[PDB]
Amino acid sequence: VLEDSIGREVINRSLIRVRRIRIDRDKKVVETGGLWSEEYVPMKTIFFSVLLGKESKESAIFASCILRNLRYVILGGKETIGKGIVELRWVKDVI
RNA sequence: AUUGAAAGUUCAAAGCUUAGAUACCCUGGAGGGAAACCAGACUUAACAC
């Protein structure tokens, strides 16, 4: 747990900045304008969120057997590049 | 009974292409195979007297 001023720098440096290109299939040259950058969040990164549910009974069956069998999920975009596979750990069994 | 409810910034996309660790560059300069050293030492034996 770092002080915030230095922590922002460490964290902003922990992000992945990638250049990507589009190459013409024929001559293996880069197509004109096909150059851009994207930011990724690395593996092992942990986010924290909460699911809130009202009392209705379909919520009960949802939370019963929809979320117990829910471990891995695809979040975000660019999934064909294999981005976005996520593990959901419920803080009701672990700790 | 909330200017509310509902809605995945998602999809396609190769950090690739061209590109000689090359060019110039004396293992050279200085440095006595020298220094020391006796071709020498000594007669002995035998019998006669």
Query: Would you tell me how many other CB atoms lie within 10 Å of the CB of residue A69?
Result: 6
- Determine the Cα–Cα distance for residues A94 and A52; give it in Å rounded to an integer: 19
- Determine the Cα–Cα distance for residues A90 and A67; give it in Å rounded to an integer: 9
HEC sequence for chain A: CCCHHHHHHHHHHHCEEEEEEEECCCCCCEEEEEEEEEEECCCCCCCCCCCCCCCCHHHHHHHHHCCCCCCEEECCCCHHHCCCEEECCCCCCCC
> Contacts by A35-38 with C-beta closer than 8 Å and gap 24+?
A38/A78
Experimental method: cryo-EM
A23-CA/B29-C1' distance, Å = 62
A42-CA/B42-C1' distance, Å = 110
A30-CA/B42-C1' distance, Å = 113
Distances (CA, A) of A75 to A8, A13, A51, A59: 24, 22, 16, 22
Unique residue bearing structure tokens 């092992």:
A44
Nucleotide nearest to A37 (CA to C1'): B15
How many residues appear in chain A?
95
